[PDB]
């Protein structure tokens, strides 16, 4: 009914291609030694500047902004705000790596981990099967919200952190670096388009659609490839260590879903919407935050280890959360 | 009937996405300066090692080897043999760029130009519209033949040229470098699969299909992006000069189709098969030979310029050949 041995195969089939691309990249960088560190950085930069922005535009444009659930958006925003508050407060007392400082980069890493899960590739096969078609729409809205708001805010935070190493000048520099990002323009053009298309009926010219799909089609595969390329340069598969890996897992699969449950209860969600909203926050970490961290070199090892170890822990964790919510 | 103003739009729509990726890459390398030469080389290496081989596997596997036209295969082989003979004989008297040696590299460039046109992306919209469904199958068989035989032989020739700078040792070195290429294994596994699938009914597991499509979907777009990246490093758009550009155009749009006509007459093709066979040889140059030339650094400027200026000359040239063949 809710779970069978055929939907588990669907989850495994959704997860395996990503790991295959990851392993291909890792072998290429380490064993085959096809790519040098500069070439790996170039591949990651191409993914960050052309693949992710075009994926974001494709996701946002094909979503009706006027059919989005206001309560889902409020729940997502409240979850992000609660996670930010918790990360800011905890860092005030307990600081990773001995209390050196840099509490803004740690908040960026914590937001990349906790509140930006992989919602489409791995979140569809399990949640849609367990619940149905409502889960599909909810997850699509969540992914649209990610690409539209949360990636842009994450990039702004990355640029603000980079600018920090009198305050208004730093914010101005971060903003100036943002308004040249392909991602902010992707989100703006995508939302403007979506509005025109779903309110005026305009259809994207076939030439432009094909042009976008030509370069954006392999975005996810290249993101996993870049993750493997980065892993090839690390001493061990757990690049961040055992303690930091445990902390990453706790943030992703306990803090994330717990604060999402708090957000859903505060917003007073009900039924399938509530259940899918609090179950999607337990989905694995996702690779776009890793791409941004690698581009800005902000603890990419932690994000990569979380991504690698979350794709395996998602299914048991999603099943555990489903069973917990059932009774 | 044969040609209208709606099929011209189809040709333009097929051509434009490639030029859009080309221009994006060119701007990135030259104006935005996102990629350094090492990073551009890394992107091209990824395209050559993962995109083109997986595209070749997809093309070969999805083609029934037992339904291929023997006469079409014979005509293609005879074209290639005649073109090789002509290139070898002409180089014996007239040498490009004054007078020097290196006649094997010039033959490789001449084969990349004359006898490896872009058959699917730009060859479908015009030939299928003018003729119908027979053109589709003929062009698919031609593309399968390319990916299966001609890319492998071109790579072997590239490796043989590289090894040259006593003869049996050079051939052994070229063979050893070949049997580690992803392309030879792609073709071999693709043909073995195609055989099993179309003779025993085996279906490729969905996981493997998704894994291949994850890394191969953005293959052509990245190839055009790499072409733009290379163009960004050249002094002028006509990287090979005016005389060499003219020679490239003559080889692609006169020698290629002319020797295809000779081959078809020798093999005694008839009707739509004959016409499509001799009209597909006039299609533009295609980017995979450029990717290989850039990887081996064998006159990449000439192949690049031919690709630049053939996508614009193909439609008038294809129309001219169609009118010539009509009467
Ligand atoms: C438009 C809606 C709002 C969206 C937000 C975007 C833009 C507007 C906001 C701009 C301000 C950004 C924060 C600057 C604060 C500087 C403080 C300082 O002064 O130092 C900061 C301290 O930071 C903090 O503790 C936390 C700051 C805020 C964290 C992030 C805020 C997130 C914003 C909105 C919620 C949504 C989040 C999700 C986004 C990602 C997607 C999941 C860093 O330096 P430090 O003092 O720790 O150095 C060490 C010095 N010693 C050793 C002496 C102590
Ligand atoms: C399995 C079926 C057959 C497929 C072919 C593959 C493998 C088997 C063949 C192996 C031999 C390869 C050629 C080595 C010859 C060395 C000659 C020499 O000694 O020098 C060669 C000379 O070359 C030539 O003139 C032409 C050689 C042959 C050209 C290519 C042959 C193509 C093969 C098959 C037909 C299909 C082609 C299409 C493939 C691409 C897809 C469109 C180079 O040096 P050079 O002397 O000019 O130097 C200069 C010295 N000075 C200045 C003193 C003169
Ligand atoms: C509305 C009109 C049609 C669409 C054109 C408009 C915007 C496209 C978005 C971004 C590129 C153009 C605007 C970017 C700001 C200008 C600066 C720039 O040139 O910034 C390139 C960007 C950052 O690089 P930088 O740090 O070197 O900047 C510094 C460059 N300098 C060294 C020269 C100073 O780098 C990059 O790769 C830029 C991204 C290149 C790949 C394209 C991604 C586009 C994403 C989504 C939209 C896609 C399709 C359109 C949908 C249909 C609409 C009807
Ligand atoms: C039959 C069993 C399943 C398929 C596995 C078999 C073959 C796959 C093809 C190629 C990779 C493995 C064999 C390659 C030869 C071994 C050498 C190697 O490791 O060579 C990697 C190749 C060249 O690199 P190198 O010059 O550094 O070699 C020197 C490396 N050392 C420095 C260590 C000496 O580089 C590369 O990227 C290699 C290519 C990596 C990307 C994969 C492309 C595969 C293409 C088509 C087949 C795809 C899917 C399977 C279809 C379904 C089948 C049922």
Numbering used by the authors:
A (entry chain B), B (entry chain A): 0 to 164, 206 to 367
From the study:
The proteins in the PIN-FORMED (PIN) family (also known as the auxin efflux carrier family) are key participants in this process and control auxin export from the cytosol to the extracellular space. PIN8 is a non-canonical PIN of 40 kDa in size, with a short cytosolic loop of 43 residues that lacks the phosphorylation motifs seen in the long auto-inhibitory loops of canonical PINs. The structure forms a homodimer, with each monomer divided into a transport and scaffold domain with a clearly defined auxin binding site. The structures and biochemical data reveal an elevator-type transport mechanism reminiscent of bile acid/sodium symporters, bicarbonate/sodium symporters and sodium/proton antiporters.
We solved three distinct structures of PIN8 using single-particle cryo-EM after reconstitution of the purified protein into peptidisc: an apo form at 2.9 Å resolution, PIN8 with IAA bound at 3.2 Å, and PIN8 with NPA bound at 3.4 Å resolution. The apo form of PIN8 displays a symmetric dimer of PIN8 characterized by a twofold rotation axis perpendicular to the membrane plane with a distinct concavity extending into the membrane along this axis from the non-cytosolic side. The scaffold domain comprises helices M1, M2, M6 and M7 and creates a large interface (1,512 Å2) to the other monomer in the dimeric complex. This interface is mediated mainly by M2 and M7, and is further stabilized by a lipid in a groove between M1 and the kinked M6. We also observe another lipid with an aliphatic tail sticking into a pocket of the transporter domain. Next to the crossover, there is a well-defined water-filled binding pocket nestled between the scaffold domain and the transporter domain that is open to the non-cytosolic side of the protein via the concavity. By contrast, access to the cytosol is blocked, clearly defining the conformation of the apo-PIN8 dimer as an empty outward-open state. The higher-resolution apo-PIN8 map reveals two peaks in the site, which are modelled as water. The highest-resolution map of the apo form was used for initial model building, but all maps display excellent density for the entire protein except for 39 residues of the disordered cytosolic loop, which were not modelled.
